Every structure is written in structure tokens, then in C-alpha cells.
Design a protein around this ligand. Structure first.
Ligand code: 1VK
Length: 468
């Protein structure tokens, strides 16, 4: 008999799995929401704002109405290379944002030391991708890397139709802190990472007024062989592609149809993405420069380190947020957490979710969320930033690991507003002027210098319908 080869690997379940980390794909968790689990790992936070700041100029007439198509193409070219490095070195890309990606090497406590070495090497090789690369006249196509290590908590929250996850805890906070100490081309280790690492491998230096350290060099001992060392480390990497599947970047590429599993995984993925996955929408429909309203919600907790308290709080907030968003076809694009604040990047006006009065509704939705979440047990402060303008939407990443992501100055603005104007609902000038709501529903705010925003324009507090 003949032996035709090539296992078919393009099933819907596999396509869905591209949008998710191994943490979720192979997780098999209880149905309770919230669900929490705990482990140890090494984290890598790669700041990619250097080249995703490209977005503004892709709206220029120069790109002849193909700005979004060109932007996703060039971004994915670069980001794909980063993802491949992460994957080949054994890491799990947890999420993408417009300005960063976060990767995890989950391992038993005893192997943290050796895995940090692996992750440093990976980091250095990532920087190596960009050492001599630019466009037009600007080589700011470079990245900044923070690494952290230690205890990590995982939270899964959602309802019967939608799920979201976060990793949280000090190591997660640490990786964020480390990355924003990094200059271009730097690899910065959190204090704990530095404490736990193989100091014989690496030369570091101090970071002024900081216990974090900068990696100057990976200088391995005389008879060290990284490839053999890596192979030893793979013993502790549950899903590293191997044997007959050593040619694949992800084990998830080998997933077979399993309706129960697919039911669980699809809950993490937006319906419009599922439509594309199911070949019921053109594969390029979701790459666009689109006017939207961003409602960025930040929840700060009474006790920031107590995962057991924050989980139920986020779940309670989520249940309300999703109900309010349904009422106006708003969608949660991302959920993020560091600094102890949990933030929901909500979007009004995504593809196929048009509808006029987007501004009035965004503001009313923001206020509703604010009022409700402010009453949630353990939520100390709610802050909401509302900004409206043209943003890039598209699936960003590698073929095998990518996510629908929104990128733009207005996303950054809403994000900065919620942090620099805590405890209130704020909006930009577009939103204020477009709502046409009475002017006394607002308060004109002092201008604040916000990191990453040049010329925010006049900003406003949405005070609401009444003085009280
Ligand atoms: N915490 C988290 N758990 O999953 N993702 C995050 C997160 O904050 C993040 C932020 C920016 C980019 C990528 C991830």
C-alpha cells in the first residue's frame, strides 16, 4: 500500500489555538469563575513600541488607502521574528498588546535558575534580530526587554460564553517595572530574577536607584555548550515540539478536533475572529484603520498582592462590564494587569459593530461601569479613559501565534488618561465635541504631561447628568 504523508493540520480548533497561549490551550481547568492557579516561571516582556509607533504615519495619503494593510504586513514581519525566537527557545507567548508582548517559561522552582539562562540567551538573540535594521532614515526598529522570575498566579474569569485570563503577582509587576527601565537594546532583570539566576553565566550592572540589573553580557564558562544545555532544559518543557514534531513551532499545530475543547477555547476569541476562522469572512476583513472609541477601564484593588481577593473582584466587575458593553456592541479587546491595576481595553465601533451615537453611548457606558465597579467589594479605585479617533485594528503576530489587536495614539491616550486622572471618567476633545451632550455634563481638566502623548488636546471629565 501507498503511504500518503502530511497529517492535515488546518482544522478550526488549530486556528483558534493560534490566538491562545499553551497556558490556556493545554490548561484543562475547572468551570468555576473565577478560577485561580499558582505556579513559578520566568517572564519576558518585550516592548515593541519602537516600531508600533509607526501607526500614525500609515494614515497619511502617502499610503494611498492601504495604510492598514501595509502596517499589519510590516509589523507582522518584525513581530513574527520575535515570536519565532520565543517559541524556539521554549517560551509561551501569553498576550500581545499594541506596544508589547509577554512571554512565559513555566517551570518547577528548581529549574528557574537554568531557565533564566535560556531566557537571557533568547533575549539577546531577539535584540540580535534588529542590530542593523531601519526604514526611511530611522533605526528605532529596536526593542526593550524586561525579565522577571518567581511566583505567578493565574486568573481565569468570564461567563458562560466568554473567557479571559491574566497572570498576576509580584513577578508580573516586576517584569513591567524591569521593561520600562530598559533602554533600546537592553535586557533588564527584576531583583528576584537576578537573585535566582546563574550568576556565573552573566555580567550585569546596577541600575541607578534600582535593585533591578542590566545584563551586559552572557559569558558562559569554558566548556559550556548552549545547545547541550538547552537540550537538558527541554526535559522540563512539557510542550516543546519534539520527535516527529520537532519541525513545528507549536505543539498546538497538532491539535485534533475535539468539540469539548473547542467549546472552551473559542470563548477566549472574538466572534468576528471566529467568523474568519470558519471561512465565513474574508481573511483580510479585520485589518483596518477604523474610527473607534476606546474606553479603557482601570480597577485598582484595596489589597494589590492578594490574588484570592482580586479574582472575585475582577469577576464581579467583568460580569457588569460585559452586560453594559452588550447593550452597545462594545467589545473587550484586551485585559491587562500590573501595578496591581486591572485594565480592560474596551472598543466601540469594531468591524461590523458600527452604529451612530457611539460617543454618547461610550460615555454613558463608561459612567455605568464606573458607578457599578466603584461598589464592587475590594475595588478601591475605578478610573476610565475615553478617547475616539482612527486606530489600527488587525491580527498581529505570527501565523502560529497571533491576536487581534488595536494600535494607535488614541489607545495610548485613553490608557494614559485612566492612570493620570484616577478615580474619574475622562474623555478627549473628539468625544466631548461629538457627544453634543450639554457642556455642563463635563468638566474641563488641567493639562497633564503624560508619558507617550504629545498634544493630547483639551481633556474633560465626564461629570454626568447631575451635579450630584
Ligand atoms: N497580566 C497579564 N496577563 O496576561 N497579559 C498580561 C498583560 O498585562 C500584558 C500587557 C501588555 C502586553 C501583554 C500582556
Amino acid at each position: 500500500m501507498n503511504t500518503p504523508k502530511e497529517e492535515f493540520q488546518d482544522w478550526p480548533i488549530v486556528r483558534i489555538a493560534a490566538h491562545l497561549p499553551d497556558l490556556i490551550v493545554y490548561g484543562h481547568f475547572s468551570p468555576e469563575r473565577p478560577f485561580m492557579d499558582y505556579f513559578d516561571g520566568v517572564l519576558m516582556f518585550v516592548d515593541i513600541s519602537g516600531f508600533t509607533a509607526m501607526t500614525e504615519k500609515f494614515s497619511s495619503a502617502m499610503y494611498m488607502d492601504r495604510g492598514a494593510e501595509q502596517l499589519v504586513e510590516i509589523l507582522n514581519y518584525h513581530i513574527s521574528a520575535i515570536v519565532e525566537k520565543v517559541l524556539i527557545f521554549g517560551g509561551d507567548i501569553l498576550k500581545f498588546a499594541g506596544d508589547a508582548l509577554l512571554a512565559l517559561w513555566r517551570v518547577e522552582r528548581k529549574q528557574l535558575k537554568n531557565i533564566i539562562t535560556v531566557v537571557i540567551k533568547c533575549s539577546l538573540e531577539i535584540h540580535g534580530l534588529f542590530e542593523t535594521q531601519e526604514w526611511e532614515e530611522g533605526l528605532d526598529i529596536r526593542v526593550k526587554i524586561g525579565l522577571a522570575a518567581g511566583h505567578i498566579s493565574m486568573l481565569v474569569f468570564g461567563d458562560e460564553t466568554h473567557s479571559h485570563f491574566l497572570v498576576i503577582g509580584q513577578a508580573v509587576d516586576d517584569v513591567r517595572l524591569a521593561q520600562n527601565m530598559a533602554q533600546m537594546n537592553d535586557v533588564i532583570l527584576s531583583p528576584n530574577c537576578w537573585q535566582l539566576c546563574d550568576r556565573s553565566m552573566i555580567e550585569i550592572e546596577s541600575v541607578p536607584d534600582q535593585r533591578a540589573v542590566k545584563v551586559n553580557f552572557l559569558k558562559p564558562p569554558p566548556n559550556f555548550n548552549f545547545d547541550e544545555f538547552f537540550t537538558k532544559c527541554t526535559t522540563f518543557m512539557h510542550y516543546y515540539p519534539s520527535g516527529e514534531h520537532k519541525n513545528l513551532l507549536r505543539l498546538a499545530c497538532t491539535l485534533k478536533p475535539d468539540p469539548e475543547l473547542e467549546m472552551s477555547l473559542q470563548k477566549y476569541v472574538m466572534e468576528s475572529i471566529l467568523k474568519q476562522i470558519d471561512n465565513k469572512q474574508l481573511q483580510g476583513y479585520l485589518s483596518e484603520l477604523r474610527p473607534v472609541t476606546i474606553v479603557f477601564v482601570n480597577l485598582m484593588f484595596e489589597d494589590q498582592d492578594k490574588a484570592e481577593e482580586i479574582g472575585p473582584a475582577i469577576q464581579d466587575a467583568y460580569m457588569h462590564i460585559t452586560s453594559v458593553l452588550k447593550i452597545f456592541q462594545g467589545q473587550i479587546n484586551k485585559v491587562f494587569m500590573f501595578d496591581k491595576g486591572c485594565s480592560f481595553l474596551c472598543v466601540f465601533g469594531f468591524p461590523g459593530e458600527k452604529v451612530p451615537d457611539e460617543l454618547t453611548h461610550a460615555l454613558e457606558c463608561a459612567m455605568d461601569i464606573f458607578d457599578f465597579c466603584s461598589q464592587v467589594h475590594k475595588i478601591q479605585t475605578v478610573s476610565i479613559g475615553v478617547a475616539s479617533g482612527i486606530v489600527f485594528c488587525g491580527i498581529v503576530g505570527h501565523t502560529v501565534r497571533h491576536e487581534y489587536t488595536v494600535i494607535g495614539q488614541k489607545v495610548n491616550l485613553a490608557a494614559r488618561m485612566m492612570m493620570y486622572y484616577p478615580g474619574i471618567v475622562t474623555c478627549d476633545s473628539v468625544t466631548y465635541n461629538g457627544s453634543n451632550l450639554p457642556a455642563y455634563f463635563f468638566k474641563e481638566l488641567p493639562k497633564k504631561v503624560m508619558k507617550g502623548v504629545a498634544d493630547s488636546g483639551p481633556l474633560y471629565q465626564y461629570w454626568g447628568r447631575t451635579e450630584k
